Nucleic acid binder design. Structure first.
Lengths: 94, 98, 80, 108, 94, 81, 98, 54
DNA sequence: ATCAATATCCACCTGCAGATACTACCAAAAGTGTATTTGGAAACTGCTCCATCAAAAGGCATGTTCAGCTGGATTCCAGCTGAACATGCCTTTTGATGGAGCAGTTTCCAAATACACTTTTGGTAGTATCTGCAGGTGGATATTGAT
């Protein structure tokens, strides 16, 4: 009884959102899982470093915002920052 | 009899192999080479199939990138033939020799 | 044990054609064989280190993925 | 009690907020973790996935196909500046290369 | 007004061991501190990764040994491994 | 404000930097080119540095921010902490 | 009738002189003004420590020296001794910066 | 290594130049520290053979 | 420009590996509520060092002239690489067998943590002190360029 968690169903939801009638193979889905894991580890490592530099003991939204700004370029950084900010305000105001 | 000029089949092959995604080395020779190389670090190792598949993907990507760099170093000297000194210059600049 | 001549000359010429090369010297084949053997032993050393640390005998795909990632050559697709 | 409306639905996302929270805790990144950090990270990850998937789907529909394969992911990544510069040092298995021949090698 | 720890005195002891009558400037000592910190963080990060891969919760001597082997080349790896092993046996047998 | 200071990197300074690199003969078009390169480099570091400074809610850029930026671009620097 | 060195002599002498030394090769004040101008383009009303600008100077000089070495290699590859912009572009392309 | 370099240049006190000369002259150290910059270190004296006269 | 010969591309067909649903279930994984602690935000303050000024002085940058040597174009030739055939060897498939080694389970025990005191030890300031080293002087030495 050994499981194996993955982001397959969430990637599938996003795909059905942006392309309602296109599918995806299994190897492309493995590529997408690898991509999500890689970017997650990058952002989390950078935020941990930022928290250590300032002698803080907590990872908050500002650490994630600054890590996003340090990692993504230009268009990507701007739009990701806007998306995350909107998400956090929508979450707290609910 | 019909004969193409030297260089026509070359560009035809270039387009063909840049349109494709296959592997370009045969699998059994590469497997034997990998096992023989691993023989010196530890004896009686086993390999999954996906391990040798990953090794082959990585090696082919590396070599194709190196060949692009070599082609640039060749064109820089006003040639079209790639020579070993172009490979040596590309690797020296990348830092792989230095 | 010339398993390095297993990488034939037409195979190297195919690899060169994919990289956009249009003409190939005759001394290129030995050079690429040397380069490839260097790269391969560099990767397999760390793969076998990762393996024997875990007290295993079978080299897994994740060991190769880690050995590649530590060289700065991340590889997507075998993360399962 | 009440209906357990979760967290990703609260934030209006598709990605899991609770799983990201657990991964941030267990991954040994800091000794405490805020409440908005998983929401922010989930939103960013979903945005990036949607971007790359839209590009890949356009490529797939361009080659008259209905199902994305790794070749389409490679064509999407390598053809965009910011993605190619974010993912400049990754190898996609079964991806191939970009069709490109130097101008001096062409005849005439 | 808070203190600032450093490896100055230990580097000085090692220097007086290998070169009994040579001194060292202050800028070279700052270089040596930077070097020690950098190598420490490298080894510790690699050992942490190794411990995470095997689902272990403890950093032991084997993790440090494997990190040393993965980071240093040839001569350096061999001699560092021998030195650390001797140190650990000397420590436990005391 | 201050504008147009890339010209303060004079031709003799670039010639000296090239001499330390082993260069014997220098084209006349190099100097301009070089300046462009340098500017790009600086813009990539200072940006990162400033991103650290605003994170701590500071207003002065310290040497540690520069060292962190250089390290995160793979250009580690020993001597300043 | 006055003494003149042949072209290339003072250049080699200067090569030895500047490879034997460790000083900085750019004036401090122009570099500081340049750094402040760029920073102002990024965020207004900034300040700087002295060690920060010193670190920036050391890093930038090291970068440019390494670039000039790679450029010299690319130039020698083409059977020249004069470095030209296309060599800088080839070196920066093989390195992976453009 | 740095002390041997320093005693070679007839000096009694190590400076960053000696650390750079020690690091760059050894294979395994230069390959461990291949991507670091040592402040006030300089470079290695080295001129290509084709640039020399004659 | 002609056209004959190849290779590529587009339409159509189809058998099949691969995507897609569903039921099951189920371990596990997330949401709710709560009581507790503690890390981080506020307000204050003291002092450090950063921006500003200025002045003098010399060391570096600018511009000009002259010449030499290097890069770039042209020509010619030899040799080395490509294109085409004809064998024949080696890879690929696929079907099956042992079997060894990896993954899950159970103990249970040696090892790591939390807590409380205590001695030391390493770090800073002040004040001090030599001393190796940077800058200057002069003379010898070695190298270059024109005869």
């Amino acid at each position: 009884r050994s499981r194996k968690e993955s982001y397959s169903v969430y990637v599938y939801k996003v795909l059905k959102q942006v392309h309602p009638d296109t599918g995806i193979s299994s190897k492309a889905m493995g590529i997408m899982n690898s991509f999500v894991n890689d970017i997650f580890e990058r952002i989390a490592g950078e935020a941990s470093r930022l928290a250590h530099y300032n002698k803080r003991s907590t990872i908050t939204s500002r650490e994630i915002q600054t890590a996003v700004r340090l990692l993504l370029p230009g268009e990507l950084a701007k739009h990701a920052v806007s998306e995350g900010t909107k998400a956090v305000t929508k979450y707290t105001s609910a | 009899p019909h004969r193409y000029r030297p260089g026509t089949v070359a560009l035809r092959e270039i387009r063909r192999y840049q349109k494709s995604t296959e592997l370009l080395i045969r699998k059994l020779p590469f497997q034997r080479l990998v096992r023989e190389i691993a023989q010196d670090f530890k004896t009686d190792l086993r390999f999954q199939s996906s391990a040798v598949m990953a090794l082959q993907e990585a090696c082919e990507a590396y070599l194709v990138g190196l060949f692009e760099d070599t082609n640039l170093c060749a064109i820089h000297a006003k040639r079209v033939t790639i020579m070993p000194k172009d490979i040596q210059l590309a690797r020296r600049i990348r830092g792989e020799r230095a | 044990r010339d398993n390095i001549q297993g990488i034939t000359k037409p195979a190297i010429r195919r690899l060169a054609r994919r990289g956009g090369v249009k003409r190939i010297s005759g001394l290129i084949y030995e050079e690429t064989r040397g380069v490839l053997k260097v790269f391969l032993e560099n990767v397999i050393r760390d793969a076998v280190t990762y393996t024997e640390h875990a007290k295993r005998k079978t080299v897994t795909a994740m060991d190769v993925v880690y050995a590649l990632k530590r060289q700065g050559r991340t590889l997507y697709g075998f993360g399962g | 009690r009440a209906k357990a409306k979760t967290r990703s639905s609260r934030a209006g996302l598709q990605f899991p907020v609770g799983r990201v929270h657990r991964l941030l805790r267990k991954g040994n990144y800091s000794e405490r973790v805020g409440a908005g950090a998983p929401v922010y990270l989930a939103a960013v990850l979903e945005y990036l996935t949607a971007e790359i998937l839209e590009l890949a789907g356009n490529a797939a529909r361009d080659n008259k196909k209905t199902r994305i394969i790794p070749r389409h992911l490679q064509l999407a990544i390598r053809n965009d500046e910011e993605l190619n510069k974010l993912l400049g040092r990754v190898t996609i298995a079964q991806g191939g290369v970009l069709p490109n021949i130097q101008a001096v090698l062409l005849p005439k």
